[PDB]
Write a protein that binds this ligand. Structure first.
Ligand code: CA
Ligand code: CA
Ligand code: CA
Ligand code: CL
Length: 54
DNA sequence: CGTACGTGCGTTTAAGCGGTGCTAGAGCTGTCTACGACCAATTGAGCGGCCTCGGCACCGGGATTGTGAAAAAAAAAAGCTGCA
């Protein structure tokens, strides 16, 4: 059991896929959230952040 | 003061209409399982709290840049002439 690594690390991301998945669930957007959606969204928020900081 | 626009004609154009004919594809039904919710147990990422030391705010001094006044030139401008 375990030897757990974060969804962020699996997707090659700094931004928290897991936090993003929980905010989509609790943010009243849809009944269900596919497993790709928070990876994609976390990626987009990382890219945009990187661009503004550059 | 100069001419770009508005009006009003005659000539030309293609929108609109009503109709027909063809089928792409919108959208519906039924089936089945891949995927996401839910759960319980596990644990490590990220939280607040705390301490430090180097960036940056602020200062004074000096270098630098830009502005405005006055004087003097360059130039357009204006009023003034006789001719033609
Ligand atoms: Ca004019
Ligand atoms: Ca179809
Ligand atoms: Ca902190
Ligand atoms: Cl998905």
């Amino acid at each position: 059991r375990a030897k757990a690594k974060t969804r962020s690390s699996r997707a090659g991301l700094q931004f928290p896929v897991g936090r993003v998945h929980r905010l989509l669930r609790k943010g009243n957007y849809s009944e269900r959230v596919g497993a790709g959606a928070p990876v994609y969204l976390a990626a987009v928020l990382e890219y945009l952040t990187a661009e503004i900081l550059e």
